[PDB]
mmCIF file of N, CA and C in Angstrom:
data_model
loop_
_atom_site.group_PDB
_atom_site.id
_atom_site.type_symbol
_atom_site.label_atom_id
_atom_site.label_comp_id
_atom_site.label_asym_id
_atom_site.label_seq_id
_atom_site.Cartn_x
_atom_site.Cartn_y
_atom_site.Cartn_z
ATOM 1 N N UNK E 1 -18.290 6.889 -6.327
ATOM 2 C CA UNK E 1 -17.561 5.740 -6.955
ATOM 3 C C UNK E 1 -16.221 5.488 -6.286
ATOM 4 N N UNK E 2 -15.733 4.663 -6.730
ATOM 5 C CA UNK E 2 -14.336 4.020 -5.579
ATOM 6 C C UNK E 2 -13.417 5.129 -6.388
ATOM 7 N N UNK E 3 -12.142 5.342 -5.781
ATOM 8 C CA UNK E 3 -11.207 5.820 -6.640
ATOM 9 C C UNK E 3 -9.981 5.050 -6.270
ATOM 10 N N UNK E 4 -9.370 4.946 -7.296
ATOM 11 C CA UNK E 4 -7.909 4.126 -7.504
ATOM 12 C C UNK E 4 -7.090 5.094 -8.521
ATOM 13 N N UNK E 5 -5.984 5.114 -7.759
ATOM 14 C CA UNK E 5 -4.893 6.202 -8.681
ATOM 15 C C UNK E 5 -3.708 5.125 -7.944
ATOM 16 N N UNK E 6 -2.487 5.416 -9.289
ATOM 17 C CA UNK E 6 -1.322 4.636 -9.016
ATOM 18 C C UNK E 6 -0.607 6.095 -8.807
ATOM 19 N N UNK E 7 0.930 5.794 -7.741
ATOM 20 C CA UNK E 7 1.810 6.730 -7.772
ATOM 21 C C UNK E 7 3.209 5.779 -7.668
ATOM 22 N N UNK E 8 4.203 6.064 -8.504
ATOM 23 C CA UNK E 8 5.352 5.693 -8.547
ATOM 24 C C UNK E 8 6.394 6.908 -7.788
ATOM 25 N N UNK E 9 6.885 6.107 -6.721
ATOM 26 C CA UNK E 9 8.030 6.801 -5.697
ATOM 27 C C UNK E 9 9.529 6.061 -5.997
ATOM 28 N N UNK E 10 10.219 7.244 -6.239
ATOM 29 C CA UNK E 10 11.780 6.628 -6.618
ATOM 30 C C UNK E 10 12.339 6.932 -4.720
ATOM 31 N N UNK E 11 12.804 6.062 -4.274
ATOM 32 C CA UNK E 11 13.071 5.738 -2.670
ATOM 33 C C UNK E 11 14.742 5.708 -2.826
ATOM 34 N N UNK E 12 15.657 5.725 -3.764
ATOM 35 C CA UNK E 12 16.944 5.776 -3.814
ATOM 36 C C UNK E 12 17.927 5.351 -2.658
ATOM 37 N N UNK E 13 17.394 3.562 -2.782
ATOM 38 C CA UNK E 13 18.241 2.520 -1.590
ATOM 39 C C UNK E 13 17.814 3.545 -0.336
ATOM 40 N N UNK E 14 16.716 3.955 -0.099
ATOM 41 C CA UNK E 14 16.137 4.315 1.088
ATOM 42 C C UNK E 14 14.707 3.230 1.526
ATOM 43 N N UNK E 15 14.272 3.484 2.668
ATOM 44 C CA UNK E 15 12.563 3.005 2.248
ATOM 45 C C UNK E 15 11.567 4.047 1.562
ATOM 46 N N UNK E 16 10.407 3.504 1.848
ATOM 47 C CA UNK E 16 9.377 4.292 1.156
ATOM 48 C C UNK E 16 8.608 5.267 2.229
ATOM 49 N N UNK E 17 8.770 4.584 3.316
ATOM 50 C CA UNK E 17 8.419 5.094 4.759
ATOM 51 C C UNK E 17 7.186 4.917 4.897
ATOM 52 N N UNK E 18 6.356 3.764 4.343
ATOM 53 C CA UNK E 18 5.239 2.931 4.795
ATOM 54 C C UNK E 18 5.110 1.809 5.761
ATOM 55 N N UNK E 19 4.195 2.036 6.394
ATOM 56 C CA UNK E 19 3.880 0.312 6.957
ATOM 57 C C UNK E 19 2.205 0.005 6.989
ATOM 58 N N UNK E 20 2.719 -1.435 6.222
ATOM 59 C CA UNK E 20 1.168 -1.663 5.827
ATOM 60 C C UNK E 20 0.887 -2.964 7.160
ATOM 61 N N UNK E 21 -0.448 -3.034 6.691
ATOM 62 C CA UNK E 21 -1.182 -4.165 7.826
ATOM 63 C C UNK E 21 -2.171 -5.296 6.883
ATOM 64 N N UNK E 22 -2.580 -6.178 7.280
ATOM 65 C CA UNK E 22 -3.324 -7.520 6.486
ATOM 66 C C UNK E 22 -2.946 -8.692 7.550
ATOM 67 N N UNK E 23 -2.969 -9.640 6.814
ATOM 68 C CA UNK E 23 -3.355 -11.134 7.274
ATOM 69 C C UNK E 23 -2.898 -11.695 6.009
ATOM 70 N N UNK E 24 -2.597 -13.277 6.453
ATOM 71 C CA UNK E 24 -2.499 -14.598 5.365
ATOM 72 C C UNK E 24 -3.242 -14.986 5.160
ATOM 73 N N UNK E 25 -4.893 -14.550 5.294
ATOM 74 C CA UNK E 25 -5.873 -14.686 4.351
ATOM 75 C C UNK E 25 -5.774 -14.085 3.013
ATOM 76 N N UNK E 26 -5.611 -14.967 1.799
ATOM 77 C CA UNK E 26 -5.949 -14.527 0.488
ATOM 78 C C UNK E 26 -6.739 -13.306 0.213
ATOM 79 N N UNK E 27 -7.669 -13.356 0.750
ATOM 80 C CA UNK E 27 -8.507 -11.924 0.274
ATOM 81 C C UNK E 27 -8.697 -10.878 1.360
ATOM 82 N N UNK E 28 -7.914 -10.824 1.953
ATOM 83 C CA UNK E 28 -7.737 -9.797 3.065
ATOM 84 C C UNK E 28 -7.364 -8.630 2.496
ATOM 85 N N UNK E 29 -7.609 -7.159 2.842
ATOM 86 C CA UNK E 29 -7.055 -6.270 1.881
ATOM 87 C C UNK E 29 -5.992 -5.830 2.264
ATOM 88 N N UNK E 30 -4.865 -5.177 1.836
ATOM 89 C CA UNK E 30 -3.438 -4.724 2.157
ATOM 90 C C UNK E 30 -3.665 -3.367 2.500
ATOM 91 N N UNK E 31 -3.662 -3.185 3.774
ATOM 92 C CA UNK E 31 -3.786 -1.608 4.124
ATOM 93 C C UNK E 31 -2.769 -0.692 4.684
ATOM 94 N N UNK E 32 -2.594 0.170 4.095
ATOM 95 C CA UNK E 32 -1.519 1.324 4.885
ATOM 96 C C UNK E 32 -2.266 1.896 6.535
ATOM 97 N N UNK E 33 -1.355 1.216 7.250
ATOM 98 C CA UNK E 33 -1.624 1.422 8.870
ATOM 99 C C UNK E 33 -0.826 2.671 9.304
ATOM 100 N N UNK E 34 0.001 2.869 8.778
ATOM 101 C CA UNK E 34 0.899 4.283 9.285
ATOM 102 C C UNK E 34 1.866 4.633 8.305
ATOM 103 N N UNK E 35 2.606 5.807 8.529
ATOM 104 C CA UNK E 35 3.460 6.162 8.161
ATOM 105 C C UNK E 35 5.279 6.746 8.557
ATOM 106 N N UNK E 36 6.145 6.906 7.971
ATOM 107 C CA UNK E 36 6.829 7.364 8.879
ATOM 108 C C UNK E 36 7.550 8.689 9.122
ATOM 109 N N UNK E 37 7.151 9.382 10.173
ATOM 110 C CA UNK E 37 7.399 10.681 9.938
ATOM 111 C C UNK E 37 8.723 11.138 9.304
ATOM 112 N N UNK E 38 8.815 11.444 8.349
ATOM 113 C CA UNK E 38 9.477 12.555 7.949
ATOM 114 C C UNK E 38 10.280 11.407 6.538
ATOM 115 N N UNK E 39 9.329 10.599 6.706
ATOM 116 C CA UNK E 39 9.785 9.274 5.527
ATOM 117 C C UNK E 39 9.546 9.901 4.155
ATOM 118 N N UNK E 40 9.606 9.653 2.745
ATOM 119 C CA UNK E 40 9.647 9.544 1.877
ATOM 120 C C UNK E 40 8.012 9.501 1.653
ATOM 121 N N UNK E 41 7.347 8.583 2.087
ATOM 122 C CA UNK E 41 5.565 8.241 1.341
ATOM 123 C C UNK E 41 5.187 9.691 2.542
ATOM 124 N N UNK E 42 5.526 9.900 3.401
ATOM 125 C CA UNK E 42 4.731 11.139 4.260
ATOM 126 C C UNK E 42 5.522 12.543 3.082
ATOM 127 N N UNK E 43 6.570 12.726 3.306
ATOM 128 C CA UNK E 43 6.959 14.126 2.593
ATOM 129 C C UNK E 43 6.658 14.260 1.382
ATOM 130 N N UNK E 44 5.568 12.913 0.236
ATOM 131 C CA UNK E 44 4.703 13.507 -1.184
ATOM 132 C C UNK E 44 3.547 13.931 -0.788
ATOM 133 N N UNK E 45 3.264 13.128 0.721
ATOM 134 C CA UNK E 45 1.390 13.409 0.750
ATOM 135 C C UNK E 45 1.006 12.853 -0.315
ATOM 136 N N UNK E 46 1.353 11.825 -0.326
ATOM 137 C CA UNK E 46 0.666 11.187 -2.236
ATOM 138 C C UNK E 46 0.404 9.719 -1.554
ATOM 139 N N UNK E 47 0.518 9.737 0.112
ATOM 140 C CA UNK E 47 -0.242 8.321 0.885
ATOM 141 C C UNK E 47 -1.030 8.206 1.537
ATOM 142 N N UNK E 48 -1.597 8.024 1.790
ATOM 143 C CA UNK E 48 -2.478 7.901 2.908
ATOM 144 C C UNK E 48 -3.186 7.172 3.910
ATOM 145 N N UNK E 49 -2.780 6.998 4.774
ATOM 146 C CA UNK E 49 -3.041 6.018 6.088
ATOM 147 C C UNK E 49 -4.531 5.641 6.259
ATOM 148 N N UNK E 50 -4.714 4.197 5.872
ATOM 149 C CA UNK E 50 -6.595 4.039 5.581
ATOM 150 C C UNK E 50 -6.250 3.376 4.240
ATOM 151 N N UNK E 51 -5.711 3.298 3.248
ATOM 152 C CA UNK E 51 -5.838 3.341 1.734
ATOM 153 C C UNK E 51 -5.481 1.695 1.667
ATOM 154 N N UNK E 52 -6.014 1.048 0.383
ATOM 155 C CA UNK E 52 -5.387 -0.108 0.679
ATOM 156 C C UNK E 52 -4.656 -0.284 -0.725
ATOM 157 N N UNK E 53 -3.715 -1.266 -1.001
ATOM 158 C CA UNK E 53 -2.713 -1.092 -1.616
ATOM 159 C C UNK E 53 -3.237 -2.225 -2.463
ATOM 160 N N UNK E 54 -3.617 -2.692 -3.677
ATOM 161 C CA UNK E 54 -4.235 -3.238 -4.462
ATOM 162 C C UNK E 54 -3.160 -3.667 -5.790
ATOM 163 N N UNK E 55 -2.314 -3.511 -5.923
ATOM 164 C CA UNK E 55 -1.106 -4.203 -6.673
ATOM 165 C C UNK E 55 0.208 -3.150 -6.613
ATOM 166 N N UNK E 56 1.335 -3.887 -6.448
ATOM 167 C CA UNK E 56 2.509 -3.097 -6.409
ATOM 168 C C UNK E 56 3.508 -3.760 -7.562
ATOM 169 N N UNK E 57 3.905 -2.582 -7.919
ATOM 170 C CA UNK E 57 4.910 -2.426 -9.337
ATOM 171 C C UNK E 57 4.464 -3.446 -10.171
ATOM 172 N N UNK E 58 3.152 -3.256 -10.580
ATOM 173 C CA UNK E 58 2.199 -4.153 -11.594
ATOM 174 C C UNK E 58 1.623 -5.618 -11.155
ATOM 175 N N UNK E 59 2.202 -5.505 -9.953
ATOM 176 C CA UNK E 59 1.752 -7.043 -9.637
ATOM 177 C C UNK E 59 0.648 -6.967 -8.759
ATOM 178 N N UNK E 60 -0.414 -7.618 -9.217
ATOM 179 C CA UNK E 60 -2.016 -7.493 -8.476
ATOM 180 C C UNK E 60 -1.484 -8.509 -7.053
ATOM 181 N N UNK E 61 -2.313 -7.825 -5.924
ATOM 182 C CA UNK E 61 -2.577 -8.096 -4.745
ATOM 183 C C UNK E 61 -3.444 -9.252 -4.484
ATOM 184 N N UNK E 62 -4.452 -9.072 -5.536
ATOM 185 C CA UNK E 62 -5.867 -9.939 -5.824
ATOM 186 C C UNK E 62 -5.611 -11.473 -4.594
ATOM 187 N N UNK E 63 -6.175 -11.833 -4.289
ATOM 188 C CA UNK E 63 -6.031 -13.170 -3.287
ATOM 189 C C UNK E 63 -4.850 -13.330 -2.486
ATOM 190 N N UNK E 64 -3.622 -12.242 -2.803
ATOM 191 C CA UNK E 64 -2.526 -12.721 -2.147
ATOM 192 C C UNK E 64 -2.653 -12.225 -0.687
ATOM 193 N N UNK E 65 -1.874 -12.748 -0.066
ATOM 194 C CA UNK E 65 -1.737 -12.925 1.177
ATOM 195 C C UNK E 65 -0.835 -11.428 1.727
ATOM 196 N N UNK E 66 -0.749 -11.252 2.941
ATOM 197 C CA UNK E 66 0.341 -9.799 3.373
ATOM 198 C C UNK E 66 2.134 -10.338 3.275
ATOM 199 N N UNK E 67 1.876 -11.633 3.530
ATOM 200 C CA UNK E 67 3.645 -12.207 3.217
ATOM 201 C C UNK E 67 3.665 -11.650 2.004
ATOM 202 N N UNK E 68 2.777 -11.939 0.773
ATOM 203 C CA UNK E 68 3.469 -11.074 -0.347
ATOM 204 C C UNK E 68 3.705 -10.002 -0.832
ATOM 205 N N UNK E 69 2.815 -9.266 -0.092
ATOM 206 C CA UNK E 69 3.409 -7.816 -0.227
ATOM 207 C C UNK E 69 4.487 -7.293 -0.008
ATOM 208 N N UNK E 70 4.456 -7.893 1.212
ATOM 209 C CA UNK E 70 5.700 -7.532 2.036
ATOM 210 C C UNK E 70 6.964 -8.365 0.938
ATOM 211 N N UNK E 71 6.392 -9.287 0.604
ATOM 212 C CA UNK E 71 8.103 -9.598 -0.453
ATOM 213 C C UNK E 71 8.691 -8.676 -1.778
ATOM 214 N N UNK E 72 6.907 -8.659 -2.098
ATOM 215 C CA UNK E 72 7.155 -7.350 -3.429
ATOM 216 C C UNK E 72 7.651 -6.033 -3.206
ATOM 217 N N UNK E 73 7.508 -5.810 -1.933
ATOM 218 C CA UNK E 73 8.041 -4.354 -1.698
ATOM 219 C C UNK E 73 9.794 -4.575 -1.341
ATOM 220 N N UNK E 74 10.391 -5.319 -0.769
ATOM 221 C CA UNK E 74 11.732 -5.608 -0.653
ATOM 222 C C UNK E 74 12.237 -6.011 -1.292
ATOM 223 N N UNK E 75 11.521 -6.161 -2.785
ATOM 224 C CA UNK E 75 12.080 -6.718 -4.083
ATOM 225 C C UNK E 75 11.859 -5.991 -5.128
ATOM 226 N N UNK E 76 11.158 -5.092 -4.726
ATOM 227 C CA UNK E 76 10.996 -3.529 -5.125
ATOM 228 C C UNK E 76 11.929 -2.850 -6.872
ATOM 229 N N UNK E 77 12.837 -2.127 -6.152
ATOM 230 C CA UNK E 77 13.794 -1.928 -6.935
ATOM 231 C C UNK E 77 13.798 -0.496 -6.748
ATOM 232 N N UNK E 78 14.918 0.603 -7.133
ATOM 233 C CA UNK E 78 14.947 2.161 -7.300
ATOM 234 C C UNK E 78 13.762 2.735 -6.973
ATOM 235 N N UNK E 79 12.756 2.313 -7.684
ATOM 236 C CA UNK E 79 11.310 2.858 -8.079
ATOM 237 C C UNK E 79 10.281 1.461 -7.691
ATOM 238 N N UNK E 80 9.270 2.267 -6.981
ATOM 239 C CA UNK E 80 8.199 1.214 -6.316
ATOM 240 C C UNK E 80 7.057 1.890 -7.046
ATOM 241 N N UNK E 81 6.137 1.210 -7.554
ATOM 242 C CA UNK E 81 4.582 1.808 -8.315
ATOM 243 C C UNK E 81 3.494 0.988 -7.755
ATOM 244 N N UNK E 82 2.895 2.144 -6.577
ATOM 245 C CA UNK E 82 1.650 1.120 -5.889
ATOM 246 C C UNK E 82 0.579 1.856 -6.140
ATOM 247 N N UNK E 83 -0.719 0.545 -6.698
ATOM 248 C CA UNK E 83 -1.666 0.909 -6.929
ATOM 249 C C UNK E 83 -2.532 0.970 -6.066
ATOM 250 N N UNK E 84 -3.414 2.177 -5.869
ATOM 251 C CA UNK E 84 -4.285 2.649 -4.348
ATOM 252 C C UNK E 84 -5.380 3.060 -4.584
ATOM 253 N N UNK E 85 -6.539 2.433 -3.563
ATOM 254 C CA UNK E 85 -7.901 2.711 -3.512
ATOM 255 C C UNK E 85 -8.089 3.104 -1.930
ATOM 256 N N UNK E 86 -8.851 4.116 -2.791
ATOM 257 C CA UNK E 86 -9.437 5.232 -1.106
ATOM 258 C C UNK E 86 -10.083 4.520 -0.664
ATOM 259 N N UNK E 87 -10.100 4.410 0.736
ATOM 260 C CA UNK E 87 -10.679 3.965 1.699
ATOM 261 C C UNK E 87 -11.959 4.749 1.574
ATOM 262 N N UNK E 88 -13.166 4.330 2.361
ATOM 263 C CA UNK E 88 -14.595 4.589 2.326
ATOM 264 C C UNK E 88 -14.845 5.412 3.699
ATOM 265 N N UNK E 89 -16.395 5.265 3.208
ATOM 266 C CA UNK E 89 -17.453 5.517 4.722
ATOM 267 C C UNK E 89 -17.375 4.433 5.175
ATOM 268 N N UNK E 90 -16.361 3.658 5.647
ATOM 269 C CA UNK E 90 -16.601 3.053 6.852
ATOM 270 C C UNK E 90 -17.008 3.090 8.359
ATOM 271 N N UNK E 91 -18.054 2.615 8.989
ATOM 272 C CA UNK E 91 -18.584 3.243 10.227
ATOM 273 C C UNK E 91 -19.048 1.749 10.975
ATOM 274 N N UNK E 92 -18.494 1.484 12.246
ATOM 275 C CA UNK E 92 -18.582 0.210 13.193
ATOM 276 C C UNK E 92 -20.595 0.059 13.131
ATOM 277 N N UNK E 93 -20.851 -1.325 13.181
ATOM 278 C CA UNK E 93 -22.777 -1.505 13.532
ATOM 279 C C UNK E 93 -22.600 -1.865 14.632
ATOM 280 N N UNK E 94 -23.365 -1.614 15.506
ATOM 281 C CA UNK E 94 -23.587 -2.558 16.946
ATOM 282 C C UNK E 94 -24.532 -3.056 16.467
ATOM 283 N N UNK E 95 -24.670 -4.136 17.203
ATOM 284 C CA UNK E 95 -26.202 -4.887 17.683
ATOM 285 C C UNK E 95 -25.666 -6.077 18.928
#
């Protein structure tokens, strides 16, 4: 089954030490592409690079675009609460 767990990180006028990836397609998913060493989201291990980010500090992702993420997270506040679903068996098809 999918799993989704939320974790709230207090970043104290620091970042969170994420960087996510997407598109301005509406239903594109918001994915954590990296991290930054020795950042804040790497030193809980409570992130994980692959995961996609499915609403932040209560606000659903649902159709939005990566401009908005990216606004919700710099509008953030003390404490950021992002909601996260594990990435899969994903595996490339040829034909």
């Amino acid at each position: 089954g999918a799993i989704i767990y939320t974790v709230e990180l207090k970043r104290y006028g620091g970042p969170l030490g994420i960087t996510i990836s997407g598109t301005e397609e509406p239903f594109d998913p918001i994915i954590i592409s990296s991290l930054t060493k020795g950042g804040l989201a790497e030193r809980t291990g409570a992130i994980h690079i692959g995961d996609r980010i499915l609403a932040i500090n209560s606000s659903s992702l649902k159709g939005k675009p990566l401009s908005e993420a990216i606004h919700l997270l710099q509008m953030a506040g003390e404490t950021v609460t992002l909601k996260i679903k594990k990435q899969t068996d994903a595996q490339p098809a040829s034909s």
